[model samples]
Target: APDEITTAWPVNVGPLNPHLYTPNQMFAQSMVYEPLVKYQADGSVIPWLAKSWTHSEDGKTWTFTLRDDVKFSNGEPFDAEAAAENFRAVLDNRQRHAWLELANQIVDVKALSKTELQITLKSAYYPFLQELALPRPFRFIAPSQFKNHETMNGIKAPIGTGPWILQESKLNQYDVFVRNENYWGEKPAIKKITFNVIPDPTTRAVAFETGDIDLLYGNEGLLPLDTFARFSQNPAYHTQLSQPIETVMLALNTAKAPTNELAVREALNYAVNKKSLIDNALYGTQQVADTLFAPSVPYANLGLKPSQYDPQKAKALLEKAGWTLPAGKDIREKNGQPLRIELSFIGTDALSKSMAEIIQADMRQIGADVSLIGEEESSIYARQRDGRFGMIFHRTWGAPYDPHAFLSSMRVPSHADFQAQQGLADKPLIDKEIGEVLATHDETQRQALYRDILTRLHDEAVYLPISYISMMVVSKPELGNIPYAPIATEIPFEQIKP
Candidate 1:
């Protein structure tokens, strides 16, 4: 118990499954499994499981030199055959993983020898290594852990060559990850980490105060502004905020009614005061976000300040669009139809509720009949996936997924971004340019292409960038500090010890 750092995760994690579409899968991934490459804090990739790699001059083919000494926690060898099996398994479920561009481009995955793994893509994708460096799907697991030697459904166990292994779990209770005795890398100093599934945010905060939870890391509005502020003010607790990793915005559905009109979308963007929203709703803990991706993300910096809050402009735009406020009527209407927009957000999140209410108030002042739809987080995500909402909470994936991976993900209709941009006449062109950006290796062409894509998305105003969000880290004194990962959701648990 002395060697373990007990933390609080809002939801119950898993039965050692890595391929599932949940935060638990991504958060626990780096602990139990190792990727072929490592994505660093500065958006660069380094060799991890694989020693080194070389690609063909054509750029469609790649060969990786794997580490021969590596073995799974179950004592299975982590060689070329095992590596190929993992890739093949991920390819087997390509449809479910289409949001990640690498899943669609993979043509073939095979092993040339015990230490050499070969990969062939549909085309030259410069972000191939970056995708492989991600925490899931590419990370290798023992063949025996798979139900039928595939990950279409799920895995039998979370056995891998990483520094930690899931030793025990109870449904809706807790998950215990201990040091992997069979790990190929140096063993972690911290022997154990118990993630107690505390559903209430207030209870989790209390757990941290009572010395039950050694560290508290915020995600998806897990730690509200008041609690974060409380932790920051109290010297007894150590609190740190990381650089802005993402833009928290409301994605206006371009395919839906009311919001379908370009003028209406621009009007919605102009109605809300983003600076005030961040300052009051977010309590100055987060930064004001104007762009879809933060400047820290590579290629996302185009020196653009395209969005500004102007309620008068919003009213003028609505008037030009033929929506007029009738005599003694508050809401604007056009041709007997009233301008009504429904904003959907996660009901469980305090920040979402607060921001949505403020936005609703602002938009109403601009003569739009705005309503708030607070739904379950899962339901909200389903709406986002199906493009069913008039407006929904959306954010960038940060780091490696930003600029390239997230943009590539936009091409897939399963995501809200794709549906949000559907009404744009240049939707097809926008998607094609994104594909071209990923395909080419030329730096100048890539730069110009990104500028064009971001600029186009900005002018469309489908996304109302509200604020830039950062990682909220709070920990006890004895365990030292918990540093932010390159990917916002991930935490390096092994780095801390008493």
Candidate 2:
């Protein structure tokens, strides 16, 4: 095992099923499959499987020159026909919840020759090329594995042309991958990798410290702040702190009773302090966030600052909104109804609990009755999706590769419909701004449009930004190819060499 790299994942990597949504899908999918294009660390896109590509004058048609002498792990040829089949299959599979909508934009896919393929879009979409580089369901698969012609045999082993292949996987336990000798690209330095599924954060930290694991990927509040700090000063380990790309915030449900009032929303924003939240709850490991977009992202409003902690201002705002605290009451009431808030968060998240308690204490000073509710992630997501919670704590969407990736959710209501439920009434303006940016194709114009949209979103107080967050990467000193600023869950295991 000297040539192998062993790591621990906080959640299940799920099955080798390429199209399924799982916590560690990025780790599994990136190792097992290859995309037509590759998204790099600096927000650039380049050819991966396809060597080069060109588009028609009208921009409706695209032709790609694929790499020759490539074959899948199952001995199936990876040619234009196979690429076209993969695209068609992704488009037709309705159960591919994450990819069906994007894949539907393809109107036609055909193979002009053994190594050349043509693609016709329904319309001119500037983001289409970049979307192909997504590390999930957009990846290519072996057509021969799908003998059923419709569904991928999720129970069967996975096969791909990437640098690694699944050697063994046990659900809720671990996954093993070995170097793919038939890989079309350069062979990886590490001969094998074993992914240990550790559900508890403390246990995962212990495993890493005791040499049971060589590396750890931190997100979802899995790595405690104390542990992260200890690892930072320990000479025995190497740590990499990523640039902020995620914003943790408290999402107010505008469809609900008290939160439906603009004054209440504004008052709540005034009651909490972002700087305190970062210093206390995050142990100063994160930056105070005033806007949804991180500073590194395009159109990020770095000048915006949260409303300073002002109990009197919050009380006055609530009072003007008809909320009053009677002489003998600890809670405020309006129209004979007590102002109560149900703040929900993921039950297993330690940071969520700390953040909720901090906000709860701050809101109490202004006579607001806030109740903390901790539930399973499934329940919390269901409530957020159904618009049944007064407020919820979570992180902002990561869109480093393309701003449009996260903006799409705001323009349209889908499963993660945080915008619609938040009562953001600027759909027309948001849609126009997003369209301008998408259609411009000019970098400066697109950047200006994004800034305008984000500035407006911050001024509107759509969501209360708490703190900007980053990933805490701890690895052995010998580990190589660690990215300085990894976007989202992207980890280049294939590129990692000892």
Candidate 3:
């Protein structure tokens, strides 16, 4: 009870309900709520909210056995009825589509009783097990919490059976929690948890050194590789890591001018030194991307290898593209117009600023003109949506058990998603292949489809992947058993102790 874990991040946790929740907000449920099933450390399926489950031979139905002993944080009974209604609330919830890919797979749910829950899917898929195993925001919800109220403030209160409870939430101050003494699972060693929202990275770093906060997230300006290395080497601190889920890449507008040229894209690719970006820019924490998928995704193909630092090849490509370098200057001109583009980056953090600056320099050396524009994170998606810029520096969604989470999202023809408006044109071949993969249960076939699609993405320079951006959080040395979850997946705090 004496040990307190204080964590800090810039992002605000909007609401506690699945419909309006954020990743970190949902993660708080790990201390209070439980999913029916859960993913083990090695990516296998395990029981969490549900003790066991069975799938029919036809793969159409999954019957889950709920733990009868479990109770919600607010003391409501957790039963099959609760499970069914909880998911029903989620599916009907406005945020269902925007929540995550895993949530969309649930066709329907039926609570047989307090202990038996029946899950009916449109089709039997292998990823269902993984889907069940993931945590909230993606995990199961209590029947009562989902229907309590429609207001945003009404949804912020968490009611879970995890080892912690929400104590207080004040804007500009930390959202506080105390141990859930009646937790059905492992009892927590730390009695108090405080999520302090701090926008300044320097202040965060100072908090870590001064022991004001026991845990700090690796925000762009805060604890990058340099900060980690400095702390890891210090005897006073310890460091642990999980595989990074998201990839930081340069997304080009394929339909736009200048960048639409393949040779121009190749030229830009050759001009930038990706290694320097990883070393100087990232402080060597991330791996230079050879492909879009991170190492965690099994179907990921490392086909689109990184081109070496080649100024000559870049110049040649530019020349072949009809861009002539001006005498004694790195600028190039074609048809009396300078080879210039407006590059956009979200300036909510220093990393974006750094990437934009480095890219500007790299393109300048390659006889291309780049104008950098830095905007707030809130405006980034809108800017990208409007195609107001040539290139943008950012990351896509986090990794899921299935590739469709990312695949179907960008490949879909209609403007069901925000990013689709940016430029996911209707490509018959790509769309058909993605659809096939989604509709099939064949693992080999799915892998093949992913390989082909990733290749196409590379061929078109859909996104210039630079590095596997690592997810980070610094905790007290006394805390142990916290596994590094690289993706959007939850950390196994059941094993952690102070």
lDDT of 2 by residue, 451-476 (tens): 78777666666677787787778888
- Stretches of model 1 off by over 4 angstroms after superposition: none
lDDT of 2: 0.75
Better of 2 and 3 by lDDT: 2
- Kindly indicate the candidate among 2 and 3 with the higher TM-score: 2
Candidate 1 at residue 346, lDDT? 88
Candidate 3, after superposition: displacement of residue 168 in Å? 1.3
Q: Which window of 10 residues has the lowest lDDT sum in candidate 3? A: 412-421
* TM-score, one value per model: 0.96, 0.92, 0.89
> For residues 230-279, what per-residue lDDT tens digits would candidate 1 score against the true structure?
88889899988877777788899888899999999989888988888888
List the candidate 3 regions with Cα displacement exceeding 4 Å. Answer: 22-26, 94-105, 136-138, 146-156, 219-225, 241-244, 326-329, 396-402, 412-426, 473-476, 480-482, 486-494
Which digits, one per residue and each the tens of the lDDT, describe model 3 over residues 1-498?
447777776654534554344534545555555667655546576687788888888787889887888877777777887666667666666343543444566677888877888887766655677655555544544555544533233444567667777788777767887877777887767778787887777677778889888776553345655777788678777676556666777877666777777788878777877888778887777767655666566677445566667989999999998999767667899987889988877766676788788889988888889998778865776766565557877565564533566676664332222232234453567777866776577778877887887777776666667877666666667765455543364544444565
- Show model 2 residue runs off by greater than 4 Å: 94-101, 152-155, 301-305, 399-402, 418-422, 428-452, 484-486
* TM accuracy, model 3: 0.89
Candidate 1 vs 2: which has more TM-score = 1
